[PDB]
């Protein structure tokens, strides 16, 4: 009878990453464009309007300018694929696709955006090589607030000092930095794990105590 | 009307990281898992092959043994998603995906591994308190070779001794250590910049003189 079909309701997408959502519809042997209406829209704003095999840019809501494109290839296989570059937190929400190829249907893909603590900038300071006390630091930003957990190489937990504030890059994200001061020695290994709950999500960087010139 | 699409002809990915390269293909109504064939192989080596619901190890090369895999849930959706863990310098090259389900197609992904000098370890010593002379030191590993540029809280003309070795821990890396000698007051700011070219990449670290 002809119906528009969605590979999934929900996509959890990665902040500052690129987004690809799909609408599927029947393509008998060949695609011809004259017939086709592809129209994507989220919260009433036009992302994309596909008509006579071109895309009507004049109608694309300003805020989607050159950040949203439509594939041209997967149309050909009965797959309407909306690609959104550099995903923002705002980009979370509900997206309607509307296809009309001899039969109009529509679907509604829900889209969550996550900002995982997954780019961990690390650094090590040998504070006083007589005492062997070092200063290991890990910093990163995501959403929501995360804790840092320090562990030795035998997974014993250690006392750190962690400092959360709002990221100055993005207003909605958090900066998290943690510092361990510990007497250790060349080649010893330590971890800093950025955890965050509901659902839990861990990202941890591996820290190797280096060897520098002359004790 | 069966073609493998690729979302990225190119992946630029960080040494030691986790890489998920993807090949998409038309899935209709249901996942005929008993039908599906996916072959992942890069530049004349075999990574993954997946015959009808089953990952066939027997064949795959040994460099991948415990580190390559196919993301299973994704197949349902039309995503032959190959994942590599602990991405090395060798793992760069040209990746092919052979997918058979309905028709059968193949596309190619280029994979670039950057190993940036970005884990910077640092020392500040007081060599002579009467002269307030300090030794500042900075060390980092990467590829290719880097130079170390030292600058100060006013951009004065500094020079140090840079010492490059092969890395003891990740065999293909350079261990570059640089050492600055200088006189200075407390809470002054210097920086050690490590520098690669091709393309010219710069990573810098800030050193604060303790009181």
UniProtKB/Swiss-Prot annotation, chain B:
Disulfide bond entries: 23-97, 138-192
| Ranges of residues in domain Ig-like C2-type | 116-208
> What upregulates it?
Up-regulated on T- and B-cells, dendritic cells, keratinocytes and monocytes after LPS and IFNG activation. Up-regulated in B-cells activated by surface Ig cross-linking.
- Which cell locations does it reside in? Cell membrane; Early endosome membrane; Recycling endosome membrane; Nucleus
Q: What is its main location?
A: membrane
GO: which molecular function terms? receptor ligand activity; transcription coactivator activity
> Modified after translation how?
Ubiquitinated; STUB1 likely mediates polyubiquitination of PD-L1/CD274 triggering its degradation. Ubiquitinated by MARCHF8; leading to degradation. Deubiquitinated by USP22; leading to stabilization.
Tissue expr:
Highly expressed in the heart, skeletal muscle, placenta and lung. Weakly expressed in the thymus, spleen, kidney and liver. Expressed on activated T- and B-cells, dendritic cells, keratinocytes and monocytes.
| Residues of the Ig-like V-type domain | 2-110
Q: Which GO terms describe its biological process?
A: adaptive immune response; cell surface receptor signaling pathway; cellular response to lipopolysaccharide; immune response; negative regulation of activated T cell proliferation; negative regulation of CD4-positive, alpha-beta T cell proliferation; negative regulation of CD8-positive, alpha-beta T cell activation; negative regulation of interleukin-10 production
Q: Which residues lie on this side of the membrane: Extracellular?
A: 2-211
Q: Name one GO cellular component term.
A: external side of plasma membrane
The condition associated with this protein in its record is: Truncation of the 3'-untranslated (3'-UTR) region of CD274 transcripts leads to elevated expression of CD274 in multiple cancers including T-cell leukemia, diffuse large B-cell lymphoma and stomach adenocarcinoma. Disruption of 3'-UTR region is caused by structural variants that stabilize CD274 transcripts, leading to overexpression. Increased expression in tumors promotes immune evasion and tumor cell growth by allowing malignant cells to escape destruction by the immune system.
Q: Which family does it belong to?
A: Belongs to the immunoglobulin superfamily. BTN/MOG family.
Quaternary arrangement and interactors, per the entry?
Answer: Interacts with PDCD1. Interacts (via transmembrane domain) with CMTM4 and CMTM6. Interacts with (phosphorylated) STAT3; promoting nuclear translocation. Interacts with CD80.
Q: Return the protein name.
A: Programmed cell death 1 ligand 1
Q: Provide the gene name from the record.
A: CD274
